[PDB]
Amino acid sequence: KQVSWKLVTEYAMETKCDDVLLLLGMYLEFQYSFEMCLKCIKKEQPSHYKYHEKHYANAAIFADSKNQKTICQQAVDTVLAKKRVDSLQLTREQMLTNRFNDLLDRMDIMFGSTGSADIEEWMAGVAWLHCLLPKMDSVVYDFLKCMVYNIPKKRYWLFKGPIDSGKTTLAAALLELCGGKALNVNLPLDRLNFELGVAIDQFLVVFEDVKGTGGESRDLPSGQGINNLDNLRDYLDGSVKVNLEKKHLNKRTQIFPPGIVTMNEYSVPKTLQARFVKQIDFRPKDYLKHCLERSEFLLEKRIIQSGIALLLMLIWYRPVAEFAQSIQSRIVEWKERLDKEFSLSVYQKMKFNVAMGIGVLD
Amino acid sequence: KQVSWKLVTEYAMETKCDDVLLLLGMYLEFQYSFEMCLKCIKKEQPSHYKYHEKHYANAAIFADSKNQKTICQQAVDTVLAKKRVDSLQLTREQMLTNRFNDLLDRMDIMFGSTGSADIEEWMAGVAWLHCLLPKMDSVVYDFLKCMVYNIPKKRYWLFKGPIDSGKTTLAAALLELCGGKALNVNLPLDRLNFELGVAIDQFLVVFEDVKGTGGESRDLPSGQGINNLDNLRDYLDGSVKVNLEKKHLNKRTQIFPPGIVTMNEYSVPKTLQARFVKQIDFRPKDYLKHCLERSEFLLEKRIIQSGIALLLMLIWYRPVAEFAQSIQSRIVEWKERLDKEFSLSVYQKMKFNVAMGIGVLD
Amino acid sequence: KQVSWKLVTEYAMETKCDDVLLLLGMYLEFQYSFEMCLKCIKKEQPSHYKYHEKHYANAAIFADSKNQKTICQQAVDTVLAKKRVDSLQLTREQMLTNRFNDLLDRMDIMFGSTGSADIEEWMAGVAWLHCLLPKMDSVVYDFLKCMVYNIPKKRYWLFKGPIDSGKTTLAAALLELCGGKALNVNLPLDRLNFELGVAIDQFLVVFEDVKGTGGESRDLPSGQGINNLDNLRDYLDGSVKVNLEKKHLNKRTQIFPPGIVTMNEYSVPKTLQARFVKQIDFRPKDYLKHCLERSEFLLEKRIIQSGIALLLMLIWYRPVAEFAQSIQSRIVEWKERLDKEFSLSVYQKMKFNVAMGIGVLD
Amino acid sequence: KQVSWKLVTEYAMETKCDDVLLLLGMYLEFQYSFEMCLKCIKKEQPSHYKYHEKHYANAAIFADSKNQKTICQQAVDTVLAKKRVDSLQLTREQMLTNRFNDLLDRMDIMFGSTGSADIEEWMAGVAWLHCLLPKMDSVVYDFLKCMVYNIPKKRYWLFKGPIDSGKTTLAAALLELCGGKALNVNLPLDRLNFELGVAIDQFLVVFEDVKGTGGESRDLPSGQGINNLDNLRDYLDGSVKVNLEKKHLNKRTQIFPPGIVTMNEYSVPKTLQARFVKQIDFRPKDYLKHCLERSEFLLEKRIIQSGIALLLMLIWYRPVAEFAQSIQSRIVEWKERLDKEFSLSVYQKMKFNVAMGIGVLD
Amino acid sequence: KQVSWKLVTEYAMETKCDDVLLLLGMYLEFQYSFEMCLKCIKKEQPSHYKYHEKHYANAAIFADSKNQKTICQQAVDTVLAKKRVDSLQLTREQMLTNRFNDLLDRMDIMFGSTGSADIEEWMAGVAWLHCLLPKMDSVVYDFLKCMVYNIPKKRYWLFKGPIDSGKTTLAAALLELCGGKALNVNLPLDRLNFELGVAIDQFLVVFEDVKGTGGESRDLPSGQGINNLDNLRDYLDGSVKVNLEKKHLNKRTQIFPPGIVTMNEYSVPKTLQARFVKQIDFRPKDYLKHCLERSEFLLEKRIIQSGIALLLMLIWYRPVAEFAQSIQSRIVEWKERLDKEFSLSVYQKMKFNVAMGIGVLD
Ligand SMILES: Nc1ncnc2c1ncn2[C@@H]1O[C@H](COP(=O)(O)OP(=O)(O)OP(=O)(O)O)[C@@H](O)[C@H]1O
Ligand SMILES: Nc1ncnc2c1ncn2[C@@H]1O[C@H](COP(=O)(O)OP(=O)(O)OP(=O)(O)O)[C@@H](O)[C@H]1O
């Protein structure tokens, strides 16, 4: 019998796989007999053991085929086609709800019976994040609500401050909570066109550590980053559709997404200042360093920079009414789990431990 | 049986779709059973539920096909070919008539019983816009005339007020009324070839926020936009037919379209200044800002910016005789529908609120 | 039955069509029934209504086909091959005779009863053009004879003078009379290879708006242009074959065509000036301005730009015996028609109206 | 009969071969009759004599085939697909454990009776290396742990010092021990995008000899290398995923791997220094130089720069319990062999010979 | 019957022909009857007259075939695959032995019964070459050893001195002896990437006449070669594998080969001077110039350029025991032939003639 190109496409759609070689590689693993499959018996990775039994008969015939990459390319095109349909037609509030449902699905597995992490350590993460800025939950609620409402010329937030201040730490967490991509505009102007092509159909972008000019009085090395941005004003404004590049494509036309710009304390033009609706002054704090020096499980597990940590913070601090009505059911269950496995006295103690510069679990 | 490539091309033309992945993604939705289709039950997106039953049989066979992107590329080529044929053979009045018809069809959808907006909020839009310039209604009709008559040299309009003065606000609204593209002449002259190539077959160009030099005493930052335009004089003049580099292909030959140039108050070289038929001196108005600070639904819904708002202004103010003969059947229904929903005192009350800087609905 | 590729190729040849999306677009229009086609009844476009009845059968089978763009690419290459053979094997006098024959076919269609032009406005245009330069009729024949004779390094003419002087108007008219292309060598050496890549197999070239240096005391801005032309001497001399280049094709070695250079009062280096046969010293004339301010149909209809006005002038001022013996038959029918529809006193009145700077038709 | 593409794909995965021409050439060597094969009789290369008999019948039919390169491209893509699966799903400890197994398999071949290597020269290498820096086996273990844990912003080590200080020697041995790629960031910005794309799916990267500025007071020539690294800060930080590109590919998005930077005593910006967790200052030593003048075999055989030498140092110095549990059985077997063939006093005499700057084997 | 693709591949293997058009052209010449081929009867070209009679029957079916360039590309990729198997699996001693075998095969033809060359004139060349430097046969042997051992960093030789000193003459002779390529790193810093890509799988690389800066006090013009070479240090050192690229291929990772740098008397950085294991200063000398004015056959037949002359020099001067054991038996037969056809007094008279600046054969 022949290969079913449809059954491959189902696997690609269900695993949301948009890399041709990753799809090829995993579909090849299914060729071996399911009765003995060691990865299935060891339960190693979700995207194998769920699917092998359904796909085995087709994977065996796929392994003989002469067209293997042409099958996978069509299957990957289908996943990209789905994403472009969704990006035009869904409301941004529903896109965020779709993103949260995937993050809650991760949280089920990580803290599950087949779990691999401790919820007490991740809540220690929340306590460290709440110390970084005054009214941390208000800032994160403002950020979500801004990215959902997407008001013209009030679309970008500026994160400013000296070295090792936590601006990247917060940006990276927001960039996993919301789906998005990072962009580096410190490169020269003639490559900039392909670089900005990564924003195609993305919900959020982060421009990381934009180098300025006039840094020499502060010992900061100068560069063209700030000057490249001031050539891109209409990409920031979002009033008009802009023609985004891609390799092996024509220009493709859309509103370029909202985002975060991070920089050191350079000067900024008035023309560029008119685009940023909000500015966050990140401060180095000596006591926050002394905590991490004793509590390194946070960084080895990448806790304080993951989007799962901010979702746990929103589950703790915000009312249920500010989640969209469909996900309120799952959010309520998670509030009951955090009320079960902690107390307010432990959480108040954890914040005190961080502020004292001792170990959070002390 | 085989896929009908003809039926796919009918959907592509009926939905005016010229992106290959978008056509692919939407056509795959039709493979599911029509009797259960939740998107049809919700009547959510027009270009789904009008078509599913007509195309369902062909989508079941397309789902098994091994040629999916090959089919859709030819369907997209057919839509692109129609647009080129039109661009050579239609008169500019027919093009603008076909453009107004498309807008009017969207007005029927937005303000219907399946509607999503209130026509008062958009007539509030007309009241806000009419304050921005003296006699806005007549400046629009002069711009429309100029783009239809396309007289050599007498082709471009210059918008050159100070910062944050509404030049983008009017430019984006005129851009959607007529159809066109924004172009980035501030990017590098060795790739500007592939930027101007976006103007192939288009009706308007807007050259967004052209940077000059010599404004630095007034804090205006330097850039090369003005020097690039002063190299493109034959493109602006529109006497001769110029050569446009369509990406990955050899050049097209055509008259580069008319359009709007937006800039801050830099100096313009005398050689370039002659290319502009008329100039608009925008300014900040503090009362107009405070009106928006209260009437926030105007910004959130993009009401002050969409071409539907200028068309409602044209429907309200101008004599029916200024519109081409085939749309006069539609305009007069909308004139009756506008006089039905509004009194003149209410509209004067809107404009009075704008001049006082209070909310337009107050 | 099956698609016949010969029939598509014949349509492309007869319409002299060399763009693939344009050929695809028009041939698709023939798929509908001939008995009721509005386009065939309205007589809108010649290249439709002449051809639908012949091709209906093939266009119906073409709409079912899966190789549509493959057929059109071979058909366009047949038209491109024909231009290659002609430009290698014809004499330049026969090339110009072929070009005049094509323009007379337009004149038949324009002034025949299905057209829309008024010949009184075109002969007013002839009267207006003759005032732009002294002895204009001699100059056109001197330019034409130069392009037919093509003596080495005596191949280019220089159009020079103040801004707003009609040099582009006359150059664009002379271009349409001859054929040819415009090139903008103010675009950078970073891309200049593909710019001169437009001159392949052309009869005439216009280098538009060439920027010099050292014009600041005359308020002229500087640029690269004159240094690019003075780097391109091997192209302007035309003694030897030069390796012209266009993307996704090999270089083709040929003699680069002769042409017109348009510039303001920049300095021209002594090495470059030795490439020009003669210069024309344009300057503004006040009466020509006040004439166009009133005879405004000239600019709107582009009458002073079109080569049809220059050809109607050559019909008026030159002997029959300057034209080739194959075309003299048509020329005498047109010469009779201009006497039958005018008089000498009417033409004298038109020129005097231009000299008075009033409306030409008065 | 016909070619089995499955048998080629087995050989490609067996030999872990990812160059298409290399695979093609080696598989063609199997076409000749096995009964007489000179390379098999001579045992010259494992990847031949192990595999010829299994593959011969398929190679005989493959040698007739008209599609040979297409077959080999599918076989190579299957091997890149495997690596793409491993890099996303394995732990970094498993990756290193797998890599050590590959090196231990080479040691069995090198020091078998079929192999050419002499263990005394390779242990002479270990003695020399342990003199280059204090506590070398602690430094190596610390580095290996740092690469496994991959802690954000604590990922890169800086090797600094004079000319001929041994920093390249030690980096090359580490780079073989845990497989990675060397990158040249001294070339201009416009080629960096392709060059940085070599890091896709690699465990480790080394930036060799990055040129700075301000060296001229110390005879060191300036370059842009340090400025380029100061633009790439987010690649060094590794907090967020960056967009990496090959030629003729779309981008791959991943965390850019940990690494080593080697440089001479140019100044480092304070923004860049914060990315480096540990700096090693190398120094020239006369006894090491004079020793290498006498034990020339070390340099001819490339012993001091090979990862096998560092693995031998780890086997001799580190406890078994520091190695991963699944290879402790192999390490114990090698520890027994080393104590069987060396005393400590032989090795202490080797180190004394090195400190004396006489020949290691004296 | 059909084309045997295997027989075309055999011919490509036996002629080492790795150009697609050359293979196509030569194989097409076999289609004519071999009974009366004049190139065969005149024995004009070995790659023809040896092979025509075997391939005639296949060339007749090849001449009718429609896939001719597809057959040739597979045949050429088979030769390229053989080279890449060899460059990894052979020892560098075998590579040089294989190269010397190929030169000896030419020499037997050149000096055979169909020989166009005269061994007297070529040994006149050996006499001239041995005068260019002291102890030339030891310089040559020291070079060969250095290339065969390829010791890290001790890899490159520098040829330095005034114009017309013979440094290119010796580099070209050593390049034809070993095989390899010449690279011009004076070309711009971006084209440099594909220029260096020519080194893939090569044995030698020769960098020709690299420009320094700061020589205008001694009439030597500035350039960028020495600044570029100081950026390529990791390629010269050969400690690490480096990334090499060809157009429309991704990078090949290998140790960049050893060889020779030729330069006039510019100053060299300490950083680059540390890479060179030996420097030769060449001085212009009058007697060699006056000899060549009378010994003109040397330049015309390119005798002093040729690796055949250096091999003849090694056969004359060096012991047999220095050559590899498999080639030694051919070396003995060539030593006998030189002692037969030259006495010592003939050769010593030639060296006296060179010193006298008279004709070598005088
Ligand atoms: N506010 C803070 N005060 C002190 N230490 C901090 C703070 N925030 C983060 N850190 C420490 O500094 C490390 C780096 O933080 P991070 O990269 O987020 O800073 P950044 O200010 O965004 O840096 P950069 O300017 O280099 O982009 C963290 O891993 C943590 O150990
Ligand atoms: N005439 C005006 N007076 C005051 N505020 C204005 C005016 N026009 C627009 N606004 C406010 O300024 C915001 C930005 O308007 P807009 O982008 O059109 O200005 P611009 O002058 O074109 O900007 P830029 O200087 O950035 O090119 C609007 O969203 C509105 O809030």
Ligand SMILES: Nc1ncnc2c1ncn2[C@@H]1O[C@H](COP(=O)(O)OP(=O)(O)OP(=O)(O)O)[C@@H](O)[C@H]1O
């Ligand atoms: N000789 C003239 N005297 C006065 N007005 C003129 C003259 N020639 C042209 N014009 C006016 O100037 C407009 C522009 O003409 P055109 O583009 O041919 O001028 P040009 O001198 O070639 O231009 P440029 O200075 O940009 O090279 C015309 O449409 C007409 O209205």
Ligand SMILES: Nc1ncnc2c1ncn2[C@@H]1O[C@H](COP(=O)(O)OP(=O)(O)OP(=O)(O)O)[C@@H](O)[C@H]1O
């Ligand atoms: N510590 C040392 N002391 C003396 N000589 C050394 C030392 N280390 C290496 N060498 C010698 O110098 C040669 C080059 O070593 P290597 O290339 O590793 O040095 P490096 O300091 O990294 O060089 P560079 O500054 O040129 O990049 C070695 O082959 C060895 O002969």
Ligand SMILES: Nc1ncnc2c1ncn2[C@@H]1O[C@H](COP(=O)(O)OP(=O)(O)OP(=O)(O)O)[C@@H](O)[C@H]1O
């Ligand atoms: N040692 C020498 N003394 C004088 N003339 C020489 C010497 N060697 C070669 N010649 C003459 O100089 C000519 C050029 O030699 P060659 O090109 O090898 O010199 P070069 O020093 O490498 O030159 P350049 O500096 O131009 O690269 C030879 O063909 C020969 O005629």
